[PDB]
Amino acid sequence: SPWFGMDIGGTLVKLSYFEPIDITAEEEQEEVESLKSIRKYLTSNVAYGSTGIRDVHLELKDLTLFGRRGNLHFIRFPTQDLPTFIQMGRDTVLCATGGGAYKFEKDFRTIGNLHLHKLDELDCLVKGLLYIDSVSFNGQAECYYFANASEPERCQKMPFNLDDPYPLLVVNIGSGVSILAVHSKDNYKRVTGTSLGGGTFLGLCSLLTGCESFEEALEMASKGDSTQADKLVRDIYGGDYERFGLPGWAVASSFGNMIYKEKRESVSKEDLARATLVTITNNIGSVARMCAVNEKINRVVFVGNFLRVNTLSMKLLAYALDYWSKGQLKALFLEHEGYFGAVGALLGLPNF
C-alpha cells in the first residue's frame, strides 16, 4: 500500500505522498502493476487532471521515514473535485484529517476494503509542523520571518530557529481561522477561531470584483489602493489621533468610504480586492495579537493556504504584528504552510 496522508478541508484537499527510493530489485518484482502505475502517475506528472497540482518546489528529498528512504511529495486539489479523486481510486489504509475525513467517510468506504482512519485536524497540524521543522527543508530552515518589517528598503525574508518551539501560537488561516496555543509536543489547545478567513477573502472578492480564482484575486489586489475604499484615521481626525497613538494611516473603518454613493461609483475592482485583502489580514493579525497577549506567547506562526503565493498578506502581518505590539510579538511563517495536517496524518500510519 502506498503511504499517503490526507487533509480534506472546506476548500482544498492536501495530500502528502511518500515515494520510496530504496526499492530493491526483488521489491520491484513484488510490486503490483496498479501500485507501480500509481507511483509512475504521481511522480511523472505535476498537474493531475484539470485541478490537481504537485508543489514540486516543496518536495523533501531523501527523507528517512518509517525506516525507508524516500521523497515526500505535496499535492493539492479542490475539495469540490474529491468525487473525481474517489472515482479514480475506484478503478489500503488511509489516514485522513480535516472536516472532510468525517463528512466524506462513507464516500471513501466505497473503495473496497479501504481502512479509513480519521485523525483530528489540529492534532495532525501540530504533529506535522513539529516534524517538518525537525527534519528541515532539504537542509534549509522551514521557519522564516521578515527582518526589519517596518522599513521597506530593509524588509527581507530571513530564517528563524524553532529548535525549542515552545511555547508557540499557531494561527491556521484556511477557509476560516483556528488559533492554537502549543505548550509542548503533547500539550496544546485551541484558543479560539474566527470565521473571517481565507474563504471570506475569496468569497467577498468574487462578489465584489467578479474574479474567478484565488490567484486572480491576489493579482487584482496587487494593483489596487485599499484607501479608496477604507476610511482612515486621518479621514476622521484630519491627522493622527495622538492621544491613543493612532497614526493617520491606520484604518478606522474598513470599506467605510463605501457608504458614499459617489465613492462607490469611482472605486475600482482592484481597489476593492486590495481592501478585502487588507481587511481580512489586519483582522487576523489583531486577533492573533490579542490571543498571544492572553496566552503570554511572543512567537506567532501563521500557516494555512490563505498565505500561499500571498506575499502581500505575509508582509502586512509581519509589519502589523511588530508595529502594534511595539516589538513584543514576532510574525513567523513556514515554507510548507498548507500541508502540515496532511503530513501529521501520514505520521499516524504506524498506529494502525
Ligand X SMILES: CN(C)c1ccc(CC(=O)N2CCN(c3ccc(Cl)nn3)CC2)cc1
Amino acid identity, residue 83?
A: P
193 is a contact residue toward ligand X (CB under 6 A): yes
Q: Is 34 known to sit in a ligand binding site?
A: no
Sign of the C-alpha dihedral computed for residues 15, 349, 59 and 309 taken in this order = positive
Q: Which residue has the cell 506575499?
A: 311
What ranges make up the beta strands (E) of the chain?
3-8, 12-20, 47-48, 52-54, 60-65, 68-78, 93-97, 115-118, 143-147, 156-159, 168-173, 177-184, 187-194, 231-232, 251-253, 299-303, 330-334
What number of helices (H) and strands (E) belong to the chain? 13, 17
Q: Which residue among 28, 33, 105, 121 is the active-site one? A: 121
Nearer to ligand ANP among residue 12 and residue 72 (C-beta): 12
Q: Is 165 in the site for ligand ANP (CB under 6 A)?
A: no
**Distance from C-alpha of 213 to C-alpha of 202, rounded to nearest angstrom:** 8
Is 27 noted as a catalytic residue in this protein?
Answer: no
Q: Taking the chain, what is the end-to-end CA distance rounded to the nearest angstrom? A: 13
Per the CB < 8 A criterion, the answer to whether 66 and 22 are in contact is no
Q: Is 253 in the site for its own copies (CB under 8 A)?
A: yes
Residue 1 marked in a binding site: no
The answer to whether 286 contacts its own copies (rule: CB under 8 A) is: yes
Out of 165, 285, 304, 344, which residue is the one contacting ligand ANP (CB under 6 A)?
304
| 216 is a contact residue toward its own copies (CB under 8 A) | no
178 is in an annotated binding site: yes
| Assigned C-alpha cell, 49 | 487532471
285 binds ligand X (CB under 6 A): yes
Binding site for its own copies (CB under 8 A): 9-11, 80, 98-100, 102-103, 120, 122, 175-176, 190, 192-200, 202-204, 206-208, 212, 229-231, 233, 235-239, 241, 243-244, 246, 250-261, 264, 272, 279, 282-283, 286-287, 290-291, 293-294
Binding site for ligand ANP (CB under 6 A): 9-12, 98-99, 174-176, 198-199, 201-202, 214, 236, 252, 304-306, 308, 338
Annotated catalytic sites, by residue?
121
